[PDB]
Amino acid sequence: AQPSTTYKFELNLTDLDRGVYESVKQTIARHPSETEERMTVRLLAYAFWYNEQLAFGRGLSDVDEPALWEKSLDDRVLHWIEVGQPDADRLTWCSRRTERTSLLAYGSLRVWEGKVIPAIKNLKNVNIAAVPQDVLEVLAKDMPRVIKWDVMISEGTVFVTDDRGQHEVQLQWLTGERG
Numbered sequence: 001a002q003p004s005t006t007y008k009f010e011l012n013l014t015d016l017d018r019g020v021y022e023s024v025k026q027t028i029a030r031h032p033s034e035t036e037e038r039m040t041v042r043l044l045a046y047a048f049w050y051n052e053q054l055a056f057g058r059g060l061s062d063v064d065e066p067a068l069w070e071k072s073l074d075d076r077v078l079h080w081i082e083v084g085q086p087d088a089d090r091l092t093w094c095s096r097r098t099e100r101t102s103l104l105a106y107g108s109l110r111v112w113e114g115k116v117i118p119a120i121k122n123l124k125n126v127n128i129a130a131v132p133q134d135v136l137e138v139l140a141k142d143m144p145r146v147i148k149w150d151v152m153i154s155e156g157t158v159f160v161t162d163d164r165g166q167h168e169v170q171l172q173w174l175t176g177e178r179g
């Protein structure tokens, strides 16, 4: 807030790696500081780590919340997901709050990786993959208010079909794994 734009996400997910087949709808609040690219990375994370208990957090608009999280019925964090370029301090402290920490990084990572990767060696179950900028820009550009994606996940590759065709998202793993 504001302009805090409301988007509706309609996801048909066919995840052949996990045997997950769902049609899901989510409402997402887009903070004015959240770019279309950032939101799109959050949507990819949602599909990539889908669970009925996975929810969008307040992301960049609230320092105490992640971009996405999966909580137990007792409100404890099973999975803490960030997007973008959080620093090693944030990863360290958040990772203590959860059994699994994931980051979908994006943007130019040369300076960031050099600072963060050496500093998180001792962290427990932190997993970091980068989204390539070319496909991200294609996916994110001029995002409509109702986002309809068909997503197929096969051999670790994410194929997103939208209104402009089928786009192949090949994540670069920096540390850890999808799980």
Ligand code: NA
Pocket: 007, 036, 037, 039, 040, 140, 143
């Ligand atoms: Na968007």
